[PDB]
DNA sequence: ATAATGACGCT
DNA sequence: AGCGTCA
């Protein structure tokens, strides 16, 4: 009478250094080398946020400064964020973004959870394919980059070895009916991404990873355990050997605070762990919700839906001004403000032809220097008008009573940074 | 002095 | 509404 969460086939696409490879298209030079991603270039030569996998074999990683990355990695190729109004500027891989969740949006319904990655709901898809095919068997030329977690198993030294004998250990398995009815849709499920990554390439040239399992955590899970350019997926039953050495912080949503307080409290490092526990005791220490969804979780079990939704819900931009440079003048803040709110009108402008819908509400957000929190301070007023001066103007009267200074000119605390964002979307 | 962002829960 | 978490 337990329902073991295997109604659901779920995807995860997420797009391997997705904005490298951004840069790589259309400058070929920077093909299959080691490459990353830079914005600004006169501190330290950057700030990196994207890098190659060739990159990545000399220990180059995000947030690393670009100076630093050559100390790493002296052959390492950089390309730096366009930068518009005195500001880093994303639109391009926004627009990189749009040609992928167009081509993932032809297949099934998704989910944009992030610029470079949608979560996909193939129950349906799977049917359908299901009964299409007559009753022949899965071949494995139809599953040519994919693994089967926990494979293979029992009685190859190259790594393309390992994946056959997994694969082909699974679908003797499958057409012997010794797997079961979720493994079979979970494996039409994977035929079915094998289909939409072949796309992908096909028609941007960008390349990526995913994951196929009966659930979204599962699927992201999955997703990162054979990058890049590989698909894995994940069974109900592999979870059992696959948690048992799982840090916890690894599963979506347990790599901050609370997966630290599960381990502490809870004195476990692995996922696994987590099933000698009643529900009622993890309620106990994490409360109802989490108590809940732990409970499930690490039995390979969750319910969050796939959403429909493949547009953002906000649209922001945001600056930093990070130590000596902190804005301490009025007119900083306003030219500021100014910059922000022209980016933002021209983005909001592209949104409503684009998708024929219209931001209502301005939010404005600023850090104070000393403050650690993300946003000091959150005010918001009426969107009525895409125009980048009344919105900026906007902007500053609902947070200039923050000024301190006595002094008409001076801005005190100095503010550490500016973000515009611009939310509840309807219908135009 | 990672930066720029986005989704969402809590009260 | 304004703040806190997680990525
Ligand atoms: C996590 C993260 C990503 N990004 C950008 C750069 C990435 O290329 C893009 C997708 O994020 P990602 O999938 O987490 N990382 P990746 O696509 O570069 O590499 P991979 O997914 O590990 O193959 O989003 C940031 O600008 N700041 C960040 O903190
Ligand atoms: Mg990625
Ligand atoms: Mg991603």
Not at 323 to 331: I, M
Not at 419 to 428: M, V, Y
Request: one cysteine or more.
């Amino acid at each position: 009478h337990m329902a073991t969460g295997q109604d659901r086939v779920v995807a995860l696409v997420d797009m391997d250094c997705f904005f490298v490879q951004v840069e790589q298209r259309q400058n070929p030079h920077l093909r299959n080398k080691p490459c990353a991603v830079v914005q600004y270039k006169s501190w330290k030569g950057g700030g990196i946020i994207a890098v190659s996998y060739e990159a990545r074999a000399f220990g180059v990683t995000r947030s690393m400064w670009a100076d630093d990355a050559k100390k790493l990695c002296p052959d390492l190729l950089l390309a730096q964020v366009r930068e518009s109004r005195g500001k880093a500027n994303l639109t391009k891989y926004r627009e990189a973004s749009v040609e992928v969740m167009e081509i993932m949006s032809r297949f099934a319904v998704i989910e944009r959870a992030s610029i470079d990655e949608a979560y996909v709901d193939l129950t349906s898809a799977v049917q359908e394919r299901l009964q299409k095919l007559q009753g022949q068997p899965i071949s494995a030329d139809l599953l040519p980059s994919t693994y089967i977690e926990g494979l293979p198993q029992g009685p190859t030294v190259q790594k393309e070895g390992m994946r056959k004998q997994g694969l082909f250990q699974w679908l003797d398995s499958l057409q012997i009916d010794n797997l079961t009815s979720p493994d079979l849709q979970l494996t039409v499920g994977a035929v079915i991404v094998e289909e939409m990554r072949a796309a992908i390439e096909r028609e941007t040239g960008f390349q990526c990873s995913a994951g196929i399992s009966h659930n979204k955590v599962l699927a992201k899970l999955a997703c990162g355990l054979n990058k890049p350019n590989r698909q894995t997926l994940v069974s109900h039953g592999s979870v059992p050997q696959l948690f048992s050495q799982m840090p916890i912080r690894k599963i979506r949503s347990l790599g901050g605070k609370l997966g630290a307080s599960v381990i502490e409290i809870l004195g476990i490092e692995y996922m696994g762990e987590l099933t000698q526990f009643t529900e009622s005791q993890l309620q106990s220490h994490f409360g109802e919700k989490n108590g809940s969804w732990l409970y499930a979780m690490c039995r390979g079990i969750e319910h969050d839906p796939v959403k429909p939704r493949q547009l953002p819900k906000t649209i922001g931009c945001s600056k930093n001004f990070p130590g000596k440079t902190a804005l301490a003048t009025r007119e900083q803040v306003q030219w500021w403000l100014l910059q922000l709110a022209q980016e933002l009108e021209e983005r909001l402008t592209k949104d409503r032809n684009d998708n024929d819908r219209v931001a209502t509400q301005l939010v404005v957000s600023i850090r104070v220097q000393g403050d650690k929190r993300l946003s000091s301070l959150r005010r918001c007023c009426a969107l009525t008008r895409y125009d980048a001066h009344k919105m900026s103007h906007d902007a500053f009267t609902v947070i200039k009573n923050c000024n301190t200074s006595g002094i008409q000119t001076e801005w005190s605390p100095p503010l550490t940074m500016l973000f515009l964002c611009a939310t509840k979307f309807s219908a135009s």
